[model samples]
Structure formats: structure tokens, C-alpha cells
Target: MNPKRIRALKSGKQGDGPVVYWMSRDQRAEDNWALLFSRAIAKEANVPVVVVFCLTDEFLEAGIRQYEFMLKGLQELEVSLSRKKIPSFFLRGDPGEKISRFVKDYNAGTLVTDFSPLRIKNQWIEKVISGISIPFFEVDAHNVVPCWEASQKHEYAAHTFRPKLYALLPEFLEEFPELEPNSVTTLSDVLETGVKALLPERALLKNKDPLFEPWHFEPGEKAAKKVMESFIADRLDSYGALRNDPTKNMLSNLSPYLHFGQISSQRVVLEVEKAESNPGSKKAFLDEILIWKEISDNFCYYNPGYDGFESFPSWAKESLNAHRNDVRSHIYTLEEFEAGKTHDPLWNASQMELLSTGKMHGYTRMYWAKKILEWSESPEKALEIAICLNDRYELDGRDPNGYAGIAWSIGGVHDRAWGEREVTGKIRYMSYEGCKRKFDVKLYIEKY
Candidate 1:
């Protein structure tokens, strides 16, 4: 593991008990820098290493749909850690209080956690730090190139950020070392109880719809690996030219896994590089897996206002503010939007896709969000409604990528000013006509 990936969050010497890896964002037992770092230190001191996950009911706008997926992953993670001779614990309630209390109860020597750029996660981190007195470390296991190391400031767009990211790829893109079993007891009461106890009785959204009947996507890491392997084997060759078509199944369908940290983007990139695919197709898929995914972290990490309108660039702000008084042709309330009652069949279907599958086609997402801005009372309202629905429904909701995508669609965060329009102003307008030219809109609506 690289020393540069570790950051000291608190100043203190190592204590005399177990080295605890407080798993947060990165949930995997294998190929995790934070867990591996904890193992290395515990190995040196001959102390035990334990993993802790603090669950909260207060995660922003997340419902049973999101909770079911996360709990499933964590349940699998507990077993994986046990196999590697690492004991794991699950505590329910406020993470800030529970994590700090657990550290004291376990007499942890050092605290380590994987990084997240979201506001709620940072607040939890702050509270935990204030209550603990031991050595603390934060690891960037999520990004191949660490977010802070990639750039100290917010990047204008992918164009400016891509070169700098590519330059450092050689240094940070090495293969991850495997986690080794420790010479200690791994028995735990939580394993017997299981992670499913954390969820409500009817948490899993089974048989929700005939469209998604026998849902092909499962929530654990084993399924994520299978999905990635199949995508590379069957879909990667056509990805370059066909990715934007909504009717085509050319997408990797990896966002849900990527969002939950069930699969590593670095590992995915490594696998793609080894596979036999067309040069153009491989580069196109790599651009999404490497550049686009990493840039979302860059955005949220630097911009404190990532989920709000304040995160937009200056030109975007000025342009949108000027159009605040423009009348909407069709303004629907949040309830209307949630129920997919809008006039546009395409927008309704996109929302239905998000509702039924807990995922949406990548290209349709842009038009879906843009339509919200077009029909809302104001830009602020559009942002609020888009985020509300996105976080509540999508499996990949409440994520940095979701926030960045919404900002790009509604506020022009990383986009240049487009032609002046009535309600959209200089923000790039995505029209139904434009979508029709790209793919079969009628087929998409009928399927959803």
C-alpha cells in the first residue's frame, strides 16, 4: 500500500489494544487500502484487528430500496471478513456517537476509516473525531488517484481534470495487495445475528413489478463481480459507438455496484486492460470508469455546496438567476413527479425506469433531469425536486455521482453556456426532439 494514500486525521500514538478499521464508504474485505493498512499496523504490534460498521436511520432521503441493497452487501462483507480471520461488529444508531463509544469499549489502539465526500458522512467523521483520543487515519480507497492529490481546487470540467488525472495514473493505479488472515480469534455474536436484523421486516422490494420480475441484479459483491465480468466479455466491444442509445444493452450497468463500493473502479479498469477489446471501445469505457467516476469525487470533495444550487459555476448562476421569473409551461408538484404523472411520455417512462429498476439508463437520465428544470417553478425548486426523487429512488442515489449529474443537468456545473432559452437560460437544453434523433423514444416509453 502507498503511504501517500493515508492521512492522519488526529494526532496521537498507537494505543495497546486492537487496531480497528471503522468501515464506512468502502465496504469490501478484499482490495481495501484502509483495512490493509489497519492489518499492517496490527501485524507489526501483534495486536488484533477488528472491523466496525455503524448504521444509522438518519441517512438522507434513503428508503427501504436503498437500505435493502446496503444491508445485503454488509451482510456478505461480515462473512468475507470472518473467513480472513478478522472479527467484525455492527452497531445500530447514530454513527458519530456509536463509533466513538465502540472505539472506547473495544479499547482500540488506532482508528482507520475509508473516505467519503458527502456531507452526512463528513458530519459523522467530525463527531467521531471530537469524541476519540486515539490515533486516527483516513484512507482514499475509493479513488485510484486520491481526490485531494488529483487537484487542490474544483476543476472546471473533465477536459481540464482529465490530463492531470492521467498524469498521476501511473503512480496510483497499481494492483491492490490482498488481505491476509491474522493470527487471532475471529468469532463474533453479530455474525450469528446477521446484518438483516438492522432492516425493517419488509425491507426487500421483492415482486415490485412485472417489468423487473426476477430482478437480474443482486446486491452482494459476488454478483457485482459477475456483472463486471459479463459486461467486459459481452458488451465492451460495442460500448464506444452504442452506449448513448437507450434501447441498446451496451452499458456496463456497474453504477449501483460502484456507488455502494461493492466493486473497485481500479480493479474494473485493471480487468478491462487485460481483456481483448477494440482499442476505441476500451478507451470509451475506461473514460467512464476512470475519468468520469473519479471527477464526481473531485467535485463533491472540493465543493461544500455539492447538493445545492450554490455549487454551480459563476456563469451558470448569473444566467439562471436572470431567468428566475420566466413562466413554466407545465409545473408539476413533487408528488406529481414521483407518480410519473407528467405529460411527456418519455420523462414519465424514465421516472418509471428509476422506480421499477432502482436504476435508469445513463443517457435518459440527462433528459429526465432537464425536464424537471423545464417544468419546475424555479431553478432552486428544480434542483430540490430532482435531488429529492433521485436520492429516494435510485439504488445509486445520495451519491456524489448523482449530485454531480443533477448539477450538470440543472445548473451547468461543468458545462459551457448554451443558446439562450425561455426558462433554461444559458443552461444546456436537452429536448425530446434531440432524444428522438438519438434513440427510439417510443420503445423506451413502451418498455418502462
Candidate 2:
């Protein structure tokens, strides 16, 4: 890996002892550039590499299902790191406070953490940077291309951002160095019973929806690799043709794993590139993995207001404002929307998919978002409801992609203004009939 992959946060190094890797977004033990880089620093320093993960019950819009999935994955991480003689700690509460104290407790020499574009994570990261006097680094292990390296400014769309990723791809897409067992076994005394003690006996939430049950998907590094292999073997060849059909199950169901950092998108892309599949189909899969995801990250990182009303392109806001008072054919409250009570069965079915599976079909999510715009009282309200529901229900909620994608559907961010229409202004529109034209709406509604 290039030394430039680690961006300095705080410049001064403190007393040499342990190199602390504050595992945040990227949670896995393998194929993690952040963890890999931390080990390299430790090896050079001749100190134990400590992996600290601060678990919180206060994550925004997270539910019991998300919590269990993340916790279970971390359970696996704890075991994996233990085998490598790396001490891993899972602290509950404010990550800044807990991890800063942990660093102080061990007299850690340098601090390394993962990257995330979300505001809450950034705020905590800032706190960590300010609280510590040691050298600090932020690794963009989440992106195949580093978020900053992909584009310095906000990109217009995938077309604008694709070339930048392609230019950088050759240098960064090489295979990862295998993480081996270390001679440093100095951290076992710090804690006992490993993950068993850290996880809760029951969930933290008391008011979770009855309709929303635990999703059937397993969460761990092992599961992620297995899913990727399955995708390459059974689904990659048919992805282009079947991805748009909600009735088909060909899309690589990797977002939740990717979102929680259980797997690296870089590893996913590398594996997909090597798979014995058609070049065009492989290219399409890479488009989602490489271009679309990074563009979303670029949008969120460069445009600080990515999840807010202010991030809308000027034309979008102006056009939406112009249609603020337009007559609505049907209007629904946030609660009504949450309950899948929309008049359109297609919309309701999409919501039901999200509610039940913790995922909606990729294509339906766009239609799901657009229908909210069409039925809601105003465009802004539509955006608000769309984000809230997505953030609440989807497993990959609060991600940059969710924010950017909803922006495209509702506020015309990263999209050109279309012909004027009632309730939508110049924002591109979708309808039930239009969705029917795309795929079997009846099958979707019936199945979900």
C-alpha cells in the first residue's frame, strides 16, 4: 500500500508504546487498509497494535436489527483479531471519550482511525483529534479510490466522476497483503470473556416494530466473502439483465456488509474484476461498485450539506420552490408513509420490502423515493420523509449513497432539470404506470 493512503490528522507523535487503531467504520480484521497500515506502524515501532472499537447505543436512526448485525459482526472481529495476537477492545458510550481514555490508559504512541463522511462520525473524529496530542491518521479504506483522491470538489454525476476513478484504479486495485499472526501477545490481560461480555443479553430498544423482525442475513467477514463468491459464481453473469427487475434476486446483496465495513469495496471490485464473466456485465457491476458509490461519497464529503435541504442544486431548489403550492393528488403524513399506507400498492410494497427484509430492491428504492415526491405536499417534505424512512428502515441507512441517491430522486441533485410538471417542478418524475412499464409491478406487490 502507498504511504499516502494514511492522511495525517494530528502531526505530533507522543511517547512510543502501543500504536492504537481506533477501528470505527471499517470493522473487519482482514482486507482492511486501515488495520493493515496500523499494523505496519506498530511493526516499525516495535509495539503491540491495539484495535479499539467504541460501541454506542446512540447511533442516529439505527434500530435493533442494525445493532445486532453490527454487534454480531464485531463478535467475529474480536475472535479474528484475538487469533492474530492483536488486542481488540469494544467500549460503549462516546467513542471520543472512551477511546481517548483508552489511549491515555495504555500510553499509545499514535492514533489511527477509519473514514466516514457522516456528520456524527466526523464530529466524534474531530473530538478525538482535538483530545489527543499524538500523531493521528484517517484511512479511506471504504472507497476503492480514496474519497479525496477521487475528486477534490463535488462531482456533477457518475459521468463526471468515473474518469477520475479509472485513472487512479490501476495503482490502487492490487491485492491486499495477508494479515499474519504477530509476536505481540501483550493485550489479553486488559479484558476477559472477549465479545461475550461486550454484547447485550437483549436489545437496547423497547419499542421496535412488530412487523420488523430480525433479517435472515448473517453478519461477519466470513459471511461477506461467502456472499461475494456466490455473487461471482451465480449472479454476476446475469446482474445487468436482472438487476432492474424487483422480481429477480440477482443484485449483489452486499450493501449492508459494505456499509458496516464488514467487507472492503476494494476487495469486492478486485474479486469481481478477476471473475470469469463477460466484460460488459463485469463493467456494469464495477460501475455501481466503483463509480456510483464513490461519486456519492464525493458528493457527501465535498458538499457538507449532503443530507440537508441546502445541498440541492440551485435549479432544484428554485424549481421546487416554484411548485411549493401546487395541488397534490394525494398527501400522506410521515407515520402513514412509515406504515406502508400509501394508496399505491407499488409504493406500499416497496416500503414493505424495506420493513421486512431491511432492504428494498435496488430499482424499487428509486421508485420508492420518487413516489414520495409525487404524493407528498412539497418537494422538501418528500426529501425529508424519504431520507428519514430510508435512514430508519434500510440496513445501509445514513450512508452517503442513500443521501445522494435520495437527492437525485427528490431534489435533482446530480441530475439535470426535466420538463415542468405539477408537484415536481423541474425535478424528474416517476409514476406507478411508469414503474409498471419498467418491470412486473404486480409481481413485486404480490411477492412483498
Candidate 3:
């Protein structure tokens, strides 16, 4: 394990109770740096290891669909931990309060958790830090190069952030050591003291989302790995070109898995690096995960206002502010946008893809968000609606990528000034005509 990936949040004596891995963001048993790090320390101290996850009724706009996907993966994670002789516990409540209580009950000597850049997640980390005296550490298991460890401050853009990641990538992208089964005595029976038993039945959060439909894919590490293998084997040869064409099923389709941490981006990059494919396709796929995905995290981690319009570039903020009162050809309510009743068939089709399936093609996601800016009454409302629809429908909702990308579409966080246009101002514009020029927009609309 890379020492650079670990950041100790709370200092304490080397007590020998047990080590608790608060499984929050990274929910997988394999390819999880946090778990590997915790296991290493626990093994050195000769203490028991436990994996705990706190369940809650409210998590952003996550509905039954997202809950089902995450819970199913966690349920499998519990079984995996059991096979490794590491007991797993499931508690029900806010992680900030409940996890500390669990740690106290176990008399945990050390607590380790995965990292997330979202403000809400950081809040929980702060809460846990305040409540605990044990040595607490946060491991950036999500990104190949940990977010803060790579960059000390907010990166200017991918152009600036890319070099930082590249410089550090070689040191951190190595394969994980085997997570062998622990042989500690039942010092603390994790299941016996667990607040609530892990259950697959928790999948029913009563998916009240109107845009949601039955998911086409399964959840869990097995399913996630299956997709990665098939992507590299079957679809990766021409992914650079095929990703933009929604008609083709060539996109990696790994975002949902990556979002939930069921699949590791490091593992994906490692696999793609070794796969026999066109160099262009391999490089493109790497960029999506390495540069773009991590860049979103970098933006969210450094820019405290990542979720707000206040985080946009000055040029973007100035440009959009100037066009705030500009006349809109159509100002639809959030309802119209959610129902995909917008005038543009292309935009509507993109939203429908999100509605019917849990994802939309990457190219049209930009167009979908751009049109929301064009049709809304105000830029504020446009950003709000795009975020709400994105969080409500997309499986990868509430992620930094979603927030950063939506902000890019509406406020130009990482994007530069474009030719001034109506309603959009200097923020880059993507119109229905532009979509038609790029591909078979008619066929895309027809398919959706």
C-alpha cells in the first residue's frame, strides 16, 4: 500500500483493540486500497478486522434504483468479507454518529475509511474525527492517484491537472496485494454486535422516482468485473469513435459501477493498459477514467463551491450573469424537463435515455445539459433543474462527476469562454443543429 494514499485524521496511541473499516464510498472487497491498508495495520498490530457500513433512509436524491444497486453490491461485499474470515457489520443511521458508536462498542484501536470529495461526505468525516480518539485515516481508494495527495490546491483544468496525475500515476497504479483471510479469534463477533444484519432485502427503498425504470444491469463486484472484462474484450477496439454514437453499445458502460465503487478505476486502467486493442481506443478509454473522472474529483475536492454556480470561471460567471435576463425562446418548468417534453427531439431523447435506462450517452449528456440552460427561466433554475434530474435519474447521481459535469454544462467550471450566444452567454453551446451535424441525430431520437 502506498503511504501517500493514507492521511491520518486523528492521532492516538498504538492501542491494540480492533481496526474498523468504515465502508462508505468504496464498497468493494477487492481492489479497495482502504481495506488493504486497514488489513495491513490490523495484521501488524495482531488485532481483529471488521468492515462496517451505515445505512440511511436519505442519501441525496438516491431512490430505490440507486439503493438497490448499492445494497446488492454491499450484500455481496458482506459475503466476501465473511469468506475472508473478516466479520462485517451493517448499522442503520447517519454514519457520522452511528459509526463512532460502532467503533466504541468494538473498542476499535484504529479506524480507516475510503475518501470522497463531496461536501456532505467531508462533513461526515469531520464528525467522525471529532467523536473518535483512535487513529483515523482516510484512504483515497477511488482515484488511481489520490485527490489531495496529487494536487495541493484546485487545478486550473484538465490541462493543468493532467500533468500532476501523470507525474504521480506510475507510483500509485500498481496491483493490489492479496487480501487474505484473517485468523483472529472471535475477539469481537462483528455480526453478533452488529446493529442490523446485512440484508439483500434492503434493496426496496420504494423507488418513488417517476423517470426510473427497471435497471438493465445487475449490481455487485461480480457483475461489475464481468462488464469490465467484456468491455475490454469486445467493445474496446473502437471505443473512441463508438462512444459518441449512442446507437452502438460500445461505451464501457462502467460509470455506474465506478460511481458505486463496485469496480476500481485503477483495475480498469490496469486491464486496459494490458489489453490488445487499437492504441487510439486504449488511450481514449484511459482518458475517460484517468483524466476526466479524476479531474471531476479534483475540481470538487479543491473548489468548495463545486456544487454551486459560484464556482464557475470568472469569464463564465460574468458571461452567464450578463445573459441572465436575456430572452428565452422557451422557458419550461422542471416538470417539462423531467418528462422530456422539451421542443428539441434530440434533447428529449437524451433525457429519455436517462429516464428509461440509468445512463445517457456521454456526447448527448453535454447537449442535454446545454439545452436545459437554453430553455429554463434563469441560469440558476437551469443549473438546479439539470442537477435534480441528473441526481434523480442517473445511477451515477450525487457523484462529483455528475456535479462537475452539470456545472460545466450550465456554468462552465472547467470549460472556457465560447462565442457569446442567447441565454447561454459565454458558456459553450451545443444545439440540436450541432447534434444533427455530428451524427445520425434522427436515428438517436428514433431509438430512444
Candidate 4:
């Protein structure tokens, strides 16, 4: 793999010291390009490799659920890295400042990090690069195709992005090489003392949250590998047909793992190719990975204001602005939505499932957002409420998928405007009755 220093924040006449892989985007041990790249550099330099993760108390639009899930994943990551002879360190404070400080403190020759297209991540990278004096590299491990290499500009839709991704597939889809530990074992003794304090005091299993206080969601590299194997062996074959059914556990439920970078998309693609020869199943899953994911990144990249009011496309902005002051049929406050007290049982169940389980089926998520558009005072208000509530509760909140999904539901991004409807105007419409026809709605409501 060709690894080049992308940016440098600090300046030194000579470069030769331990390599630091800032563990940000990709949190796991295996199938991580940034980690592997660091190991290669460390081997060449004849020095040890260190992995650092900085925990900030504030992540935009994220809350306790996101923090809990991430902390659990990081705890497992530390254990896995120990076996590989790489030291993992956890720091608290702003990432940009923490990483810059770590680079200087360790006297690191090179710093490696995974790519993230989100605004906050990009901003952090900018700040770190501007402030540090060492060579820094960014490896694109999140997507099957790297974001910059996939397309230089924002794509119009899935159709526009699909071919570009397909053309680059051969070059980007190679299997990750095994990361072997160096013979030079340099343990960060501080880890043992810090991990005990850093990890959640009580097992997540005992938490009072109904979403399995003892969350069995596997973390780290071993768990990620097992989950991928299980998906390919048992679930992938039925993925195409049953992916949209909320009542069925037909999905691989791998998004949270994917989100936390516990597993890479390349790993998933390679594993699926080896297991299932079914083109449909492969196509279905890959679309979510490439088209949906890349499009979300593209939006976040081109539109810096994506999470705010100004990011809506011209048509969406005009329409929403025109009807901003329009009267409402039903106005459910954030509190109402949070408590699952909406008039619609289907919506309530979807909200309940998210709060209780830290996840909601993809299809139900779309329907859930659309109903909010219908019931709220205006499309803009609906967008605000849905985005806020989803980000607040779901483990995968504040994600590109969440933003894109909400934008599509309310603002017509990546979606064509439907015939006129109340509040939503030309935005897509989904109703409770429509959901009832598709799935066993009664069963879902009862289960939640």
C-alpha cells in the first residue's frame, strides 16, 4: 500500500521516532488501514507504534447512547491492541489539541489517522495539522472506495455515484493484510491503570436502560470478525428480500459496528464476496455502503452547513421558507416524541424501539421521519424535531446516514418531490396505514 504524509503540523529538520496512529475514525484493531500503515512505518523506523484515542465531552448532536456504545468499543479495542504489542492510550479533551500534544510528548516521527468527511472531523484535522510539527498521514479506511478518490465533487444522486464507485472497485477492494505485532514489545504501562478508570464502571449489562442494560453488542476486532462471518453464513442470503421488513431480524445489524469503525467496509465487502455468490445480496448491501454512505459524505463535504438550516438545496429552502409560518394540524413537542406519546402507534413504537434498543430498522427509520413531517407545523420544524430526536437517542446518531435520511425525508435531497401534500408540500409522504400494509404493525407495536 502506498502511504504518503498528507499534512504536517510541526517542523523538525530530521524525522525519526516512534509512530503514533491516532485512533479516531477506525476504532478496531484488525482491518484498519491507518493502524497497519503505522505498523509498517514503525517497522521501517525500528521503533514502537502507539495508538491514541481522545475522548471529548462534547460531540455535536450526540449524547449518552453514542458515548456508551463508543466507550464499550474502545475498551475492547485496547485489549485487542495489547495482544498485537501496540500500545493504546486514551486522552480526554478536544481531539485537535490532545493529538497535537501527544505527538510532541511522544516525540513521534509520523502520525497516521483514518479519513472522516464530516465537518467536525475535518475541522479537527485542520486544527491538528496547523498546530503540529510532525508528518501526518490520512488513510481512507471507512469506505470501500476512499472519499477523495471516489469523486472530487458532490454527486447528484445514487445513479451518479454508482458508476464512479464501480469503476474504482477493482483498485480499492483489495483485502487488508494481516497486522503482525513487532518483536519489540513496548507496553504503555499507563494503560492498565487508565483502562480501569476509563472503561464504564459497571458492565453495560447492568444499566437500567431497557435496551439491554447488559448490551451484548460485540466490540473490538474479534467480535467484528465473528459478526461478519455470521452475517455471510446466515443472514446475507435473505438480506435483499427482507432488509425492509421491520418485524423480521433479517438485517445483519452491523451498522453500529461499522459506524464505530470496529469493522471496515472493505472487510465486509471481501467477506461477502467469499461467502455469497448471490449478486442481489451483494448489490443490496454494497449500495448502502457505497451510494448511501458516500452521498452522505458528499453532502457533508460540499455543504458545510449541512446540519443547520442553510444546507437545504435551493428548492427545499425556498419551499420550507415559504411555508415556515403555515398553520399546523398536530404539533408534537420533542418531549412528546421522546416519550413515544405520538397519536400514531406505529411512530410511537419506532421511537420506543430506538430509545429501548439503541437501534431502529432502516425502513422503520424512514417511515418514522416521514410521519414527523406530516404531523408537525411545517416541514422545516419537522426536520428539526426528527433530526434532534434521532440524534439524541440512537447510538448511530449524528451520523451521515441520519442526516441524509432526515434531509431526504424533509428537504428532498436524493429524493424527487412528490405531488403536493400538507405541511410536507412536495416532500415524500409515508403514512401509518401504508406501514401497516407492509408489515405486521400490530406485532411490532406489541413487541416494543
Which candidate leads in TM-score?
1
lDDT of 3: 0.82
- 1-448, model 1: which lDDT tens digit per residue? 7888898889886677899998888878777878888999888778899999886756434655666677778889989988988988888789888988988888889999998999988998889989999999998988998888999999989899889999998999999887878897622343334334533432233454323322747988888999999999899999998989988889999888888889888889889998998999999998887788888998999999998889999999999899898887999999899878999999999987887788889999999999999999989999999999888778888889999999999999878978999889999988888888988889998898
Cα lDDT computed for each candidate against the true fold:
0.85, 0.82, 0.82, 0.74
Could you tell me the lDDT of residue 57 within candidate 2?
Answer: 47
Error of 1 at 131 (Å): 0.8
- Best candidate according to lDDT: 1
Across 1-448, the per-residue lDDT of candidate 3 in tens digits comes to: 7798998788986555778888888889999998988899877778888888887546434555676677678778888898999988887778888988987887888899999999888888888888888888889999999888788887767788778888987788899889967876421243233313323312222364344565578888999999999998899998987878777789888888999999899999999998899988888888889998998888898889887888888888888888889889998998777777878888888877887788888988898888888988888888889888888778888899998899888988776776988778988888777767778888888888
Better structure of 1 and 2 per lDDT: 1
Task: For model 3, state the Cα shift of residue 54 in Å.
Answer: 0.5
TM-scores vs. true structure, each candidate: 0.94, 0.93, 0.93, 0.89
Report the C-alpha lDDT of model 4 over 1-448, residue by residue, as the tens digit: 6443133344544345678888777888888888887888887667788888887646433644566567767777888788888878888789878888887787888888887767768778888977677777777777777776777787757788888889987877787789979777512343343344534432132344334332636555667778878878888888888888899987777878887888887878787777744789778987887789777877776777776667666776776676666676678887787777877888888987887777888999898887887777766578789888877777667677778888877777877656765566666778777877888899999988
Residues 291-359, candidate 2: write the lDDT tens digits.
888888888898888877799988989988888988888889998888787778888899888888898
Query: How far out, in Å, is residue 190 in model 2?
Result: 18
Q: What range of 10 consecutive residues in model 4 has the weakest lDDT sum?
A: 201-210
- Per-residue error for 78 in candidate 1, Å, reads 1.0
Clashing pairs in 3: none
Ranking, TM-score, top scorer first: 1, 2, 3, 4
Model 1, global lDDT: 0.85
